[PDB]
Write an enzyme that holds these catalytic residues in place. Structure first.
Site, mmCIF file in Angstrom:
data_model
loop_
_atom_site.group_PDB
_atom_site.id
_atom_site.type_symbol
_atom_site.label_atom_id
_atom_site.label_comp_id
_atom_site.label_asym_id
_atom_site.label_seq_id
_atom_site.Cartn_x
_atom_site.Cartn_y
_atom_site.Cartn_z
ATOM 1 N N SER C 134 -7.540 -3.801 -3.861
ATOM 2 C CA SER C 134 -8.593 -2.803 -3.792
ATOM 3 C C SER C 134 -9.027 -2.262 -2.432
ATOM 4 O O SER C 134 -8.870 -2.987 -1.493
ATOM 5 C CB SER C 134 -9.861 -3.963 -4.422
ATOM 6 O OG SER C 134 -9.914 -5.335 -3.808
ATOM 7 N N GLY C 138 -12.088 -7.063 2.033
ATOM 8 C CA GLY C 138 -11.583 -7.041 3.480
ATOM 9 C C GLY C 138 -10.021 -7.627 3.371
ATOM 10 O O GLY C 138 -9.361 -7.093 3.886
ATOM 11 N N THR C 139 -9.783 -8.700 2.722
ATOM 12 C CA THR C 139 -8.709 -9.263 2.311
ATOM 13 C C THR C 139 -7.597 -8.027 1.584
ATOM 14 O O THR C 139 -6.883 -7.652 2.380
ATOM 15 C CB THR C 139 -8.389 -10.378 1.415
ATOM 16 O OG1 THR C 139 -9.466 -11.153 2.067
ATOM 17 C CG2 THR C 139 -7.305 -11.207 1.209
ATOM 18 N N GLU C 248 12.610 7.802 -11.153
ATOM 19 C CA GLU C 248 12.478 9.139 -11.836
ATOM 20 C C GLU C 248 11.023 9.741 -11.756
ATOM 21 O O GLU C 248 10.793 10.781 -11.308
ATOM 22 C CB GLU C 248 13.318 9.210 -12.940
ATOM 23 C CG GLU C 248 12.644 10.244 -14.049
ATOM 24 C CD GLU C 248 13.231 10.265 -15.277
ATOM 25 O OE1 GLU C 248 13.459 11.416 -15.872
ATOM 26 O OE2 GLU C 248 13.547 9.180 -16.011
HETATM 27 N N1 GTP Z 1 -11.317 -3.339 -11.967
HETATM 28 C C1 GTP Z 1 -11.549 -4.566 -10.944
HETATM 29 N N2 GTP Z 1 -11.954 -4.462 -9.725
HETATM 30 C C2 GTP Z 1 -12.290 -5.787 -9.197
HETATM 31 C C3 GTP Z 1 -11.973 -6.927 -9.945
HETATM 32 N N3 GTP Z 1 -12.364 -7.873 -9.074
HETATM 33 C C4 GTP Z 1 -12.734 -7.384 -7.950
HETATM 34 N N4 GTP Z 1 -12.586 -6.014 -7.889
HETATM 35 C C5 GTP Z 1 -13.068 -5.155 -6.771
HETATM 36 O O1 GTP Z 1 -12.851 -6.053 -5.574
HETATM 37 C C6 GTP Z 1 -13.856 -5.446 -4.841
HETATM 38 C C7 GTP Z 1 -14.071 -6.618 -3.557
HETATM 39 O O2 GTP Z 1 -13.000 -7.196 -3.185
HETATM 40 P P1 GTP Z 1 -12.466 -8.533 -3.933
HETATM 41 O O3 GTP Z 1 -11.332 -8.439 -4.851
HETATM 42 O O4 GTP Z 1 -13.767 -9.179 -4.818
HETATM 43 O O5 GTP Z 1 -12.249 -9.796 -2.769
HETATM 44 P P2 GTP Z 1 -11.018 -9.431 -1.639
HETATM 45 O O6 GTP Z 1 -10.368 -7.954 -2.047
HETATM 46 O O7 GTP Z 1 -10.237 -10.440 -1.421
HETATM 47 O O8 GTP Z 1 -11.859 -9.212 -0.237
HETATM 48 P P3 GTP Z 1 -12.477 -10.261 0.444
HETATM 49 O O9 GTP Z 1 -13.671 -10.771 -0.493
HETATM 50 O O10 GTP Z 1 -13.221 -9.922 1.738
HETATM 51 O O11 GTP Z 1 -11.872 -11.651 0.596
HETATM 52 C C8 GTP Z 1 -15.061 -5.119 -5.425
HETATM 53 O O12 GTP Z 1 -15.250 -3.936 -4.978
HETATM 54 C C9 GTP Z 1 -14.320 -4.819 -6.758
HETATM 55 O O13 GTP Z 1 -14.687 -3.442 -7.017
HETATM 56 C C10 GTP Z 1 -11.518 -6.809 -11.204
HETATM 57 O O14 GTP Z 1 -11.323 -7.872 -11.682
HETATM 58 N N5 GTP Z 1 -11.380 -5.816 -11.779
HETATM 59 MG MG MG Z 2 -12.140 -11.485 -1.681
#
Ligand code: GTP
Ligand code: MG
Ligand code: GDP
Ligand code: GDP
EC number: 3.6.5.-
Lengths: 42, 98, 434, 431, 429
Positions: C134, C138-139, C248
Site C-alpha cells: 500500500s 509507512g512500512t 507476454e
Molecule cells: N484494500 C485494502 N487496503 C488495506 C487493507 N489493509 C490495509 N490497507 C491499506 O493500508 C494502509 C495503511 O497501511 P497498513 O497496511 O495498515 O500498515 P503498513 O502498510 O504496514 O504501514 P504501518 O502501519 O506504518 O506499519 C491504509 O491506507 C489502507 O488503505 C486491506 O485489507 N485491503
Molecule cells: Mg502497518
C-alpha cells in the site's frame, strides 16, 4: 441466521437488565451504615 | 452509574489453556511452536475477528472435501498434466544444476 | 517450471495474501493442513511439495507490527504456512516513509533477503515476483521501496509485478499519506516492471452498486483482489487455448520505460440474484469492462486515450465471440486510441472457469474476463496528488518528523519534480501527430 | 514487545489510574487478587503491554504511584483493586506541598525524584521493547503539577526516543478550588511544551456538565468522573492490545497529530454516552456515534471548538463496523462544514479500527482532535495569572522556596508566544 | 426516503399532536410499548415516514414537542400514548409568555430556540431525503403564536427548499377566551405570509358547531375537537404513506393548489361525519361523500364560501373504489355552481386516490380548498386589532419587551395589502 443471533443477543441484554434490577431490590432491602467501624463507644 | 447497561461479556457470551497453563510466555512459545489443539471455529460459535470470519468456513479433519460437504464447489478441473519428460527435466534441474 | 513468488508487505499485504492463498488452496484442493488426499503440476507454480507430501506456499508475508502476523499464526492456516516465512518486526514505521526506509527497514532487510533467497533456490526456473503493498502505510511504502531497490540489483532481469493500494482521492485513512505516496513513486518508477494501483473508494462503489452489499468490510475487497490475481495467473496454472505468461503481458502493455501503470477491471461481478435474470455472454462482459462505472480506479478513460489493452478471457469462452466483440468495440468512436497504435487488444484464453468461495459475494459463472488497460487518463490522479502535496509542503507541515528520522529535505522537492516530469511525459504521449 | 509504564502523580493521579486499572483488569479478566479466570485467549495474547509476569499465574501492575502525602495511598491500597499493586512501586514522601508548585518542584521534590527514577528504570529495563511511558496528573495541585513536571524532564533526557503521554487535568475558571492555582498552571505548561510528546486537556467542569445534561445523574461523585477519563484512555491504546481491521497505536496518531512540535494539546471525547431514558429509544449505528461525538456539548475540554478551526482530527473506533459507513461519514463532516476545517490540510481526519468492542458495550468511538479553541483556555488563564502577578500577591510563598522572579516572566512569555503563533495558524492562507 | 418531522408548539399544539400521534399509531399497528403488532405487510412498509427505527423492534416518533410551560409536558407524558416519545425531544422552559406574543417571540423565545434548533437539525439530518417539515400551533397563545413564528423564520433560511405546512389555529371573533388575541393574531399572520408554503386555518368555534349539529354530541371536549383535526391531518399524507391508484403527496397538492406565493391559506374538510342515528339510515357511496363535502355546514373553517369564489379545490379520496363517479362528481359540481368558481381557471378540482382505507371505516375523503371567502376572517381581525390599537390599549406589555411600535403598523399594513390584492383576484375578468 444473522438476524436470529442478533435477536437472541437483545433478549440476553433484557435478561441482564432484569437481573440487575432484582439485585438492586435486594440491596435496597438491606440496611447498614457501619462502614466497617461503628463508633468505639457503640 | 455509567454502565449499568447489561454487562454482556463478549467472549464469555460467545484446550490451548490446558497446553500453556494460562501463562503468557508459554502461549507465546506455543504460538511460535504451533502446538495449539483448538481453532477459532473449534471454540467460538460466532466469528470474533476479521480473519476469523474470513476463515470460519473450513474443516480441520484431513478426510474432508468442501466438495462433498456442499456440492456447488464442484467444478470441472481442466488441470494440465506435466508430461514425464517435463518432470524429468524439472527434478533434474532441481537436484543437478548441469 | 513456471513459478511466482509472493512478497506481500504490510497489513494490506498480509490480508490480501491471506485472501489469495485461501482462494488458491480452494481451487487446487489442498487441505488446510496442507494435504491433497483426493486419491499434477498446477499447484507447482504456487505450492511446493515437501518430503512427507505436504505443500508449502511460496510467499514471504512481512510486517513491522506483530499482531497482524500473529493472527495468521493462530488462524486456520497455521499448519499450512511454514513459520519462518512469516516475518515480523517489533515496531512499525507508523505511517512514516522515513522510518520505513532508513531506521527500521535496514534491520530486517537481510533476513527477508535470505528468506527470498531460499525460496528462489527452491524454484528452478522462476517466472515472476508478485509484490503487494500500500502507498499509505509507512512500512508498506518505505520497506517496500528498499526491498525493490535491493531486489533490482540482486535479480537484475526478473519480472517484478507490483500490486499497490493507491490513496483514494476523497476518502483517506491517513493525513500524512501524500508525502509517503510521493516519495514511493520514485522507487515504483525506476524499480518496477508493472503496477496495478487499486483504489478502495472505487471498489466500494463497484461492490455497493453491483453486489448489493450495503455494508462491506476489508474481506469483501480482498476477495475481489484475489479473483483479479487468480484471473491473471489462471493462464499459467490451468490449461487453455491461448495461454499467456507474465512476460507476454509485460511486453505488450508498456509503451515507454516510464509508463508502467495500467488499470485492472474485472467482469462480471454481480450477485447471484443479479445473475439469475441475466444471460451472460462475451459481448456483455467485454462491454461491461469498458464502462467508467466499473473502472477500478477513480479516473475516466473517456477523458484520455488507451494505448494498450490486455484481455484475459476465462471459462467456456469462444474466440469467435471474442473476435466479434473486439470488432464491435473497434467499430466505435466511443473508444479513442492514439494515432500510433492501430491495434491494441491482447487476447488470452483459459478454459477453467473461476472458482467461487463460500462466504464470498460473486456468483458461480461459466465465463468471465479481465481487462488490463494502459491509458493516459490516469494523469489526473497524480495531478490531484500534486495539488494536495504542494499545498501540504508549502507550510512545511509534518516535515520535522521525517527530518528527525533522518531523510534530507531536498528529496521532497526531488520526488515532486520527478512525478511532475512523469505527468508531462503522459501529456506528450497523449499528444497526437495529426 | 510494546510495553507501557503507567506513571501516577497526585491525589488526582492515584484516583484516576485506580479506576483506570479497575477497567483494564476487567478488560483482561483479572481478579482483585491477580490471576486470570477468563476464557478469552486474546485477552492473554497481549496482556504484557500493561502487566508483568509473576509466579503462580499472577500478573502485576507496571505502575508507579507517586504522592507527597501519606493519606492518599492507603485509599488506593484498600479499594476495589487495592491489593493488585505491589508495595515497592508505592513511592511517597512524608511532607506535602500545600498546593505550592515550587515546593514539589524544587524543595521537597528533590529528595524523592531519586527513588521514583530508580523504580521506573527497573520497569523500563524489565520490558524488552518499551513503547513509551504514560502519566496522569493535575495542574492544580502541588505534586502532579509540581513533582510531575520534574519527573518528565529527567526521563526525557534518559529516554528521548520513547513516547510520553500526559492526561493533564487543567483547572477551570468557572469552578476552581485553589487560590494559588494560576501560579502552578502557568509554571507547568511551560514544562509541558518543551518536554511532552502527547497531551490531553481534561477539565473537571466539563465532566460536571456532561453528567448533569446527557447522563442526568442526580448526585455525581468523582468516581463517575474517573470512569470517564479511564474509558477515554482505554480507547487510545485499545488498538494496541487487540487486533483490528485497520490497526494503529499511539505513535501512529502521534506523527499524524503534530504538524508542528509546539502543538500537542488535544480535546478528548467519548461517543456512546446516553441516559437511562435514552436507552430504550435508540438504535446503535455508525452515524449515531458520529452525531453524538461531533456535538461540542460532548467534549470533555473546556472550550467550544466552533470559535476555532480543526487542525487535525482522529477517530479511534472500537467494535465491529462496516468501513464504507466509517469513511463516508468522515468525508461527510469535512464537506458540510466548510468553515471549521483548516484548508492547507485536506483530509484532516485519521481513523483507526479495533475489532474488539468496548467493555460492557457493542459499539463505541474515541476522538482526539487539534483545534484552535485550545488557545481559549490559556489566554483566559493569562487573564488571571497576570492579575495575580502585577501586585506580587502570594509571591513570598514561592520566593521563599529559592527561585527568582524572572522564572514567572519567562513562563508567561513562552505561554504568550505559544498562543501568539497558535493564532497565526488559524488565520493562514493555504494558496 | 420521504420523511416528515412533526413540529409541535403550545398547549393546543401538544394536545393536537398527541391525538395525532395516537391516530397514526393505530393506523400503523403500534402498541403503547412501541413494537409492531399489526397484521398486513402494507401496515409496515413506509413506517419510516413518521417513525424512526430503534433497537429491539422499537419505533419512536420524529417529533419535537415544545412549550414554554413545563406543566403541559407532564400531561403529554401521562397520556395513554405518552411514554413512546423520547424524553430528549421534549424541550421546555421554566416561565411561559402569559399570552404575550412579544415575550414568546423576542425575550423568552431566544433562550429556547437553539435547543429546539439542535433537536430539529438532529432529526432532519437523520433522514436521508427529507420531504419537509410540518407544524401545528395556535395563534391565540404565547408560544405557538410567538416563538412558533420564530422557529419557522429560522428554518426557512436554514432549509429553503423543504416544504412547510402549518395546521395553525386561528382565533374566533364569536368565541374568544383571550383579550390580547388580535394583537398576537395580527403579529403572526404577517410572519405566515412571508414564510409558509401552505396553511390550514383551524377555528375552534367551527368544530364546536360541527359537534353540536353533525355528530350531535352532548358534551364535546377538546379530545373530540382533536379527533376531527387529527383525522384531517392524517388524510393529507395518507397517499404518501400508502400506494394508490392515483398517488399524491405534500408537493403534489401545494404546486397544484396555489397560483401565487401571497395566497397560501386553505379550507380543510372531512367527509364521513355522521351522528350515530345517521349510521342506520345511510348508504356508503361516493356521491354521498361529495354531497357532504361541498356543504359549508360540514366545513371546519370560520367562513362561508358562498360569499366568495373558489380559486382551487383539492379532493383526496381514500379506500377501494371505482373512480368513474369521481371524475363526474367533480365535473358535475363544477358546472352547477359555476358562479362560485373563478373563470380564469377551468378544471379547478385536483384529485388523488389512496388505496388503503382508514381503520374502522370503509370510505373516507379529505378536501383542501383555496377560496376567496378566506379574506372574511382577516378583515374581521382588522376590525378588532384596529379597535384596540387606536387608543394604544394593552400596549405597555409589548412595549416593555423592547420592540418599537412601527412593527404594529407594518403588520397592519401587510395584511391590509394581503386582503386588498386578494380582493382583486375576486373581481378579475
Ligand atoms: N484494500 C485494502 N487496503 C488495506 C487493507 N489493509 C490495509 N490497507 C491499506 O493500508 C494502509 C495503511 O497501511 P497498513 O497496511 O495498515 O500498515 P503498513 O502498510 O504496514 O504501514 P504501518 O502501519 O506504518 O506499519 C491504509 O491506507 C489502507 O488503505 C486491506 O485489507 N485491503
Ligand atoms: Mg502497518
Ligand atoms: N475529576 C477529578 N478531579 C480530581 C479527583 N481528585 C482530585 N481531583 C482534582 O485535583 C485537585 C487537587 O489535586 P492535588 O491533590 O492537590 O494534586 P497533588 O498536589 O499533585 O497531589 C482538585 O482541584 C480536584 O479538582 C478526581 O477523582 N476526579
Ligand atoms: N381545538 C383545540 N384548541 C385548543 C386545544 N388546546 C388549547 N386550545 C386553544 O388554544 C388556546 C390557548 O393557547 P395557548 O396554550 O396559550 O398557546 P401557547 O401559548 O403556545 O401555549 C385556547 O384559546 C384554546 O381554545 C385543543 O386541544 N384543541
Amino acid at each position: 441466521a444473522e438476524k436470529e443471533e442478533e435477536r437472541q443477543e437483545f433478549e440476553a441484554g433484557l435478561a441482564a437488565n432484569k437481573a440487575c434490577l432484582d439485585k438492586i431490590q435486594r440491596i435496597l432491602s438491606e440496611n447498614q451504615a457501619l462502614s466497617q467501624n461503628v463508633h468505639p463507644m457503640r | 452509574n455509567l454502565y449499568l447497561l447489561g454487562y454482556q461479556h463478549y467472549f464469555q457470551s460467545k484446550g490451548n489453556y490446558s497446553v500453556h497453563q494460562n501463562s503468557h510466555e508459554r502461549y507465546q512459545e506455543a504460538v511460535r511452536k504451533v502446538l495449539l489443539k483448538t481453532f477459532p471455529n473449534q471454540v467460538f460459535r460466532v466469528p470474533v475477528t476479521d480473519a476469523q470470519n474470513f476463515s470460519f468456513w473450513r474443516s480441520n479433519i484431513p478426510g474432508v472435501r468442501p466438495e462433498k460437504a456442499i456440492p456447488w464447489i464442484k467444478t470441472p478441473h481442466h488441470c494440465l498434466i506435466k508430461s514425464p519428460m517435463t518432470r524429468f527435466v524439472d527434478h533434474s534441474h532441481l537436484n543437478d544444476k548441469t | 517450471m513456471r513459478e511466482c513468488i509472493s512478497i506481500h508487505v504490510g497489513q494490506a499485504g498480509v490480508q490480501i495474501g491471506n485472501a489469495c492463498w485461501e482462494l488458491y488452496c480452494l481451487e487446487h484442493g489442498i487441505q488446510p493442513d496442507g494435504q491433497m488426499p483426493s486419491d499434477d503440476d498446477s499447484f507447482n507454480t504456487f505450492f511446493s511439495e515437501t518430503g512427507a507430501g505436504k505443500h508449502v506456499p511460496r510467499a514471504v508475508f512481512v510486517d513491522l507490527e506483530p499482531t497482524v502476523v500473529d493472527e495468521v499464526r493462530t488462524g486456520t492456516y497455521r499448519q499450512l504456512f511454514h513459520p519462518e516465512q512469516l516475518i515480523t518486526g517489533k515496531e512499525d514505521a507508523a505511517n512514516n516513509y522515513a522510518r520505513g526506509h532508513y531506521t527500521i527497514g535496514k534491520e530486517i532487510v537481510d533476513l527477508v533477503l535470505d528468506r527470498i533467497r531460499k525460496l528462489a533456490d527452491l524454484c528452478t526456473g522462476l517466472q515472476g515476483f508478485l509484490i503487494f503493498h500500500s502507498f499509505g502505510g509507512g512500512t508498506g511504502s518505505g520497506f517496500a521501496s528498499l526491498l525493490m531497490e535491493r531486489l533490482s540489483v540482486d535479480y537484475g532481469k526478473k519480472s517484478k509485478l507490483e500490486f499497490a493500494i493507491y490513496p483514494a482521492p476523497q476518502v483517506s485513512t491517513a493525513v500524512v499519506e501524500p508525502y509517503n505516496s510521493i516519495l514511493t513513486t520514485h522507487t515504483t518508477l525506476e524499480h518496477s516492471d508493472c503496477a496495478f494501483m487499486v483504489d478502495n473508494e472505487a471498489i466500494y462503489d463497484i461492490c455497493r452498486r453491483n453486489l448489493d452489499i450495503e455494508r462491506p468490510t476489508y474481506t469483501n475487497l480482498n476477495r475481489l483482489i484475489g479473483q483479479i490475481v487468480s484471473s491473471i495467473t489462471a493462464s499459467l496454472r490451468f490449461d487453455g487455448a491461448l495461454n499467456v505468461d507474465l512476460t507476454e503481458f509485460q511486453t505488450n502493455l508498456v509503451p515507454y520505460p516510464r509508463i508502467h501503470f495500467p488499470l485492472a477491471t474485472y467482469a462480471p461481478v454481480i450477485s447471484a440474484e443479479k445473475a439469475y435474470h441475466e444471460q451472460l455472454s462475451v459481448a456483455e462482459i467485454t462491454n461491461a469492462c469498458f464502462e467508467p462505472a466499473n473502472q477500478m480506479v477513480k479516473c475516466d478513460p473517456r477523458h484520455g486515450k488507451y494505448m494498450a489493452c490486455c484481455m484475459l478471457y476465462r471459462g467456456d469462452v469462444v474466440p469467435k465471440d471474442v473476435n466479434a466483440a473486439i470488432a464491435t468495440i473497434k467499430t466505435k468512436r466511443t473508444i479513442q486510441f492514439v494515432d500510433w497504435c492501430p491495434t491494441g487488444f491482447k487476447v488470452g484464453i483459459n478454459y477453467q472457469p473461476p472458482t467461487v468461495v463460500p462466504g464470498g459475494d460473486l456468483a458461480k459463472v461459466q465465463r468471465a474476463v479481465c481487462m488490463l488497460s494502459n491509458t493516459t487518463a490516469i494523469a489526473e490522479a497524480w495531478a490531484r496528488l500534486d495539488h494536495k502535496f504542494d499545498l501540504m509542503y508549502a507550510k512545511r507541515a509534518f516535515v520535522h518528523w521525517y527530518v528527525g528520522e533522518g531523510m534530507e529535505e531536498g528529496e521532497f522537492s526531488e520526488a515532486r519534480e520527478d512525478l511532475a516530469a512523469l505527468e508531462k511525459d503522459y501529456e506528450e504521449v497523449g499528444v497526437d501527430s495529426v | 514487545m510494546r510495553e507501557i509504564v503507567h506513571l501516577q502523580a497526585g491525589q488526582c493521579g492515584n484516583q484516576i489510574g485506580a479506576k483506570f486499572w479497575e477497567v483494564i483488569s476487567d478488560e483482561h479478566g483479572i481478579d482483585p487478587t491477580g490471576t486470570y479466570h477468563g476464557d478469552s485467549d486474546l485477552q492473554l495474547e497481549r496482556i504484557n503491554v500493561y502487566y508483568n509476569e509473576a509466579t503462580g499465574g499472577k500478573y502485576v501492575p507496571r505502575a508507579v504511584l507517586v504522592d507527597l502525602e501519606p493519606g492518599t495511598m492507603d485509599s488506593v491500597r484498600s479499594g476495589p483493586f487495592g491489593q493488585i499493586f505491589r508495595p515497592d512501586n508505592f513511592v511517597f514522601g512524608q511532607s506535602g506541598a500545600g498546593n505550592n508548585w515550587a515546593k514539589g518542584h524544587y524543595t521537597e521534590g528533590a529528595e524523592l525524584v531519586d527513588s521514583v527514577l530508580d523504580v521506573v528504570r527497573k520497569e523500563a529495563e524489565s520490558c524488552d521493547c518499551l513503547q513509551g511511558f504514560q502519566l496522569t496528573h493535575s495542574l492544580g495541585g502541588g505534586t502532579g503539577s509540581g513533582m510531575g513536571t520534574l519527573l518528565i524532564s529527567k526521563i526525557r533526557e534518559e529516554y528521548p526516543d520513547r513516547i510520553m503521554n500526559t492526561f493533564s487535568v487543567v483547572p477551570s475558571p468557572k469552578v476552581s478550588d485553589t487560590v494559588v492555582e494560576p501560579y502552578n498552571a502557568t509554571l507547568s505548561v511551560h514544562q509541558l511544551v518543551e518536554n511532552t510528546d502527547e497531551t490531553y486537556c481534561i477539565d473537571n467542569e466539563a465532566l460536571y456538565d456532561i453528567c448533569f445534561r446527557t447522563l442526568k445523574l442526580t448526585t455525581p461523585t468523582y468516581g463517575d468522573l474517573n470512569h470517564l477519563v479511564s474509558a477515554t484512555m482505554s480507547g487510545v491504546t485499545t488498538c494496541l492490545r487487540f487486533p483490528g481491521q485497520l490497526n494503529a497505536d499511539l505513535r501512529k496518531l502521534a506523527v499524524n497529530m503534530v504538524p508542528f512540535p509546539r502543538l500537542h494539546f488535544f480535546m478528548p471525547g467519548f461517543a456512546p454516552l446516553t441516559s437511562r431514558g435514552s436507552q430504550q429509544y435508540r438504535a446503535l449505528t455508525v452515524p449515531e456515534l458520529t452525531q453524538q461525538m461531533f456535538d461540542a456539548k460532548n467534549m470533555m475540554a473546556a472550550c467550544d471548538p466552533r470559535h476555532g478551526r480543526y487542525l487535525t482530527v482522529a477517530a479511534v473506533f472500537r467494535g465491529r463496523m462496516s468501513m464504507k459507513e466509517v469513511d463516508e461519514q468522515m468525508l461527510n463532516v469535512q464537506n458540510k462544514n466548510s468553515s471549521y476545517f483548516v484548508e492547507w490540510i485536506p483530509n484532516n481526519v485519521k481513523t483507526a479500527v479495533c475489532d474488539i468492542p468496548p467493555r460492557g458495550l457493542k459499539m463505541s468511538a474515541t476522538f482526539i482532535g487539534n483545534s484552535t479553541a485550545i488557545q481559549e483556555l490559556f489566554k483566559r488563564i493569562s487573564e488571571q495569572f497576570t492579575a495575580m502577578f502585577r501586585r506580587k500577591a502570594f509571591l513570598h510563598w514561592y520566593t521563599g522556596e529559592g527561585m527568582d522572579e524572572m522564572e514567572f516572566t519567562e513562563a508567561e512569555s513562552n505561554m504568550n508566544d505559544l498562543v501568539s503563533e497558535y493564532q497565526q495558524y488559524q488565520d493562514a492562507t493555504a494558496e
